Amino acid sequence: MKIGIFDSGVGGLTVLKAIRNRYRKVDIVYLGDTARVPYGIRSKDTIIRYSLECAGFLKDKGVDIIVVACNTASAYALERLKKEINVPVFGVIEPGVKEALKKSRNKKIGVIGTPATVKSGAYQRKLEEGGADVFAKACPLFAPLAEEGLLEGEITRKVVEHYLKEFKGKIDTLILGCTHYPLLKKEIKKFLGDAEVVDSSEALSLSLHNFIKDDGSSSLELFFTDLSPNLQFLIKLILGRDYPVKLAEGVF
Amino acid sequence: MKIGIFDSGVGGLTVLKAIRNRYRKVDIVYLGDTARVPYGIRSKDTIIRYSLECAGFLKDKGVDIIVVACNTASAYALERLKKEINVPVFGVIEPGVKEALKKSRNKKIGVIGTPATVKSGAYQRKLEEGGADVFAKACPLFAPLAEEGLLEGEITRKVVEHYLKEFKGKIDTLILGCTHYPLLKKEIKKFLGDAEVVDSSEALSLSLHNFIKDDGSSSLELFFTDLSPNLQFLIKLILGRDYPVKLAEGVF
Numbered sequence: 001m002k003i004g005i006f007d008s009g010v011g012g013l014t015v016l017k018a019i020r021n022r023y024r025k026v027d028i029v030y031l032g033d034t035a036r037v038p039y040g041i042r043s044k045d046t047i048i049r050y051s052l053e054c055a056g057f058l059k060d061k062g063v064d065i066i067v068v069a070c071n072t073a074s075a076y077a078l079e080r081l082k083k084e085i086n087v088p089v090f091g092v093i094e095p096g097v098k099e100a101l102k103k104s105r106n107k108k109i110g111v112i113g114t115p116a117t118v119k120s121g122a123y124q125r126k127l128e129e130g131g132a133d134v135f136a137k138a139c140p141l142f143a144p145l146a147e148e149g150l151l152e153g154e155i156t157r158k159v160v161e162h163y164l165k166e167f168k169g170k171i172d173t174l175i176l177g178c179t180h181y182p183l184l185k186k187e188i189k190k191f192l193g194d195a196e197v198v199d200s201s202e203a204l205s206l207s208l209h210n211f212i213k214d215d216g217s218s219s220l221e222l223f224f225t226d227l228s229p230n231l232q233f234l235i236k237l238i239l240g241r242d243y244p245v246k247l248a249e250g251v252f
Numbered sequence: 253m254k255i256g257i258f259d260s261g262v263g264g265l266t267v268l269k270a271i272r273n274r275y276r277k278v279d280i281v282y283l284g285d286t287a288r289v290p291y292g293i294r295s296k297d298t299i300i301r302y303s304l305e306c307a308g309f310l311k312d313k314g315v316d317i318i319v320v321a322c323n324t325a326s327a328y329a330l331e332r333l334k335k336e337i338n339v340p341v342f343g344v345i346e347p348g349v350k351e352a353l354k355k356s357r358n359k360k361i362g363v364i365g366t367p368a369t370v371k372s373g374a375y376q377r378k379l380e381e382g383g384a385d386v387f388a389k390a391c392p393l394f395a396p397l398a399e400e401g402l403l404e405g406e407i408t409r410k411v412v413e414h415y416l417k418e419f420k421g422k423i424d425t426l427i428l429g430c431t432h433y434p435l436l437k438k439e440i441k442k443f444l445g446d447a448e449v450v451d452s453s454e455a456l457s458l459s460l461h462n463f464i465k466d467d468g469s470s471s472l473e474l475f476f477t478d479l480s481p482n483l484q485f486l487i488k489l490i491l492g493r494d495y496p497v498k499l500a501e502g503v504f
């Protein structure tokens with residue numbers, strides 16, 4: 001069968017790797033909407049229109065299911081997607097909430113997400129409806145202004161502290177909605193102390209087991225709506241080798 | 253006297269601190285053009301028009317000299333600024349080149365700069381006219397697409413390696429035009445091995461000694477063209493305390 005996967009960037013290539021490795025024969029089409037790259041800032045409805053278009057493009061590429069590996073899109077576009085694309089649609093939020101609810105002990109769990117994903121309340125609601133005291137904070141948006149220059153040393157593990165304030169000693173499991181410097185993973189586990197961090201990518205990939213008929217030609221096709229700067233090198237580093245990419249709407 | 257300092261962001265607050273500390277009485281007006289925050293991408297002439305406007309705003313605020321702490325602006329706008337603002341204008345490139353030329357031993361020196369600053373050839377020319385074999389590379393622009401998630405561990409010190417390839421064992425001094433994850437400072441010195449990294453901020457601040465009449469009321473005024481998200485917190489962390497900021501063109 002053929003799996004379609006989309007994301008606003010190259011982050012979805014992680015989930016895509018989990019899947020390709022677990023589902024050996026399955027065919028895969030990837031769409032990274034690099035042309036509109038900063039999704040997480042835009043309004044709910046723009047997130048929805050963008051998603052509908054990328055999911056429509058994957059559908060017209062003959063795919064059987066659609067995995068939206070983007071937190072923000074998953075948070076606002078899932079319903080609309082399911083209702084308009086006539087295929088099974090899967091997001092990265094529910095397998096993470098499940099994995100969080102499961103892995104916890106004290107049911108006090110934190111979520112570091114994009115200001116737009118944190119704003120939807122999707123994780124919050126889903127965690128609470130699982131009997132959880134949720135501690136959620138938005139991704140710190142620093143790079144636009146400042147560089148990792150000021151933000152190095154003192155200030156890096158002072159921004160962490162201040163940001164993961166409420167989490168201090170109440171949570172034991174964390175959903176890493178998204179990490180952006182200085183709130184990297186190694187920096188946050190060292191402040192929170194060793195906590196069980198959800199692997200949303202393995203949870204998602206694993207989660208499609210019942211829907212996936214593990215059959216096909218192991219084909220992979222990469223598509224992006226903007227052939228951005230170092231994208232071609234990012235691919236070689238995430239997938240392990242060089243994979244040829246196409247501009248979404250080229251030969252088609 | 254009054255010193256005007258501008259930057260596209262909050263990075264100039266570092267130079268501003270060096271200056272305030274070295275020139276105890278000097279008055280200071282700061283303008284961060286946060287509204288148009290990603291300068292380093294825009295064309296030369298747009299960089300020049302933007303600069304002219306910020307320098308004009310500082311001039312109309314009665315300042316005596318203007319420090320452009322931005323590499324990109326310094327690289328393309330200095331001439332035009334001097335020619336149109338009737339005051340002494342100082343950039344961050346020449347004090348760094350001087351400090352590089354001086355500190356070297358083998359006159360083989362590298363420059364990690366923004367794609368636009370690296371493109372101007374300003375450092376290159378100035379280093380070469382000082383008898384230097386320059387090794388320059390542009391800042392890797394990753395955050396738009398990818399997050400520091402993929403880029404953590406293996407890939408962080410693999411992007412470094414690949415990027416600081418030509419520098420390997422030929423340079424002994426580096427001008428850190430600008431650092432953006434994963435090419436942080438601690439990550440780059442560990443690959444290049446211990447090399448003498450130029451402190452462009454202390455070089456610039458020190459460099460204004462002959463022009464500065466160390467007199468005034470030690471006043472500080474912060475202005476930004478966009479009262480961005482976590483800007484107010486970035487200030488408390490760089491300067492050490494809370495400083496009230498104004499929107500450029502508010503009360504004026």
Ligand SMILES: NC(=O)CC[C@@H](N)C(=O)O
Binds near residue numbers: 176399
């Ligand atoms: N794989 C991911 O972490 C996706 C993150 C992305 N959904 C975000 O909101 O930043």
Ligand SMILES: NC(=O)CC[C@@H](N)C(=O)O
Binds near residue numbers: 147149324453
């Ligand atoms: N202080 C600085 O490093 C300024 C850097 C800034 N000029 C840049 O080009 O990114």
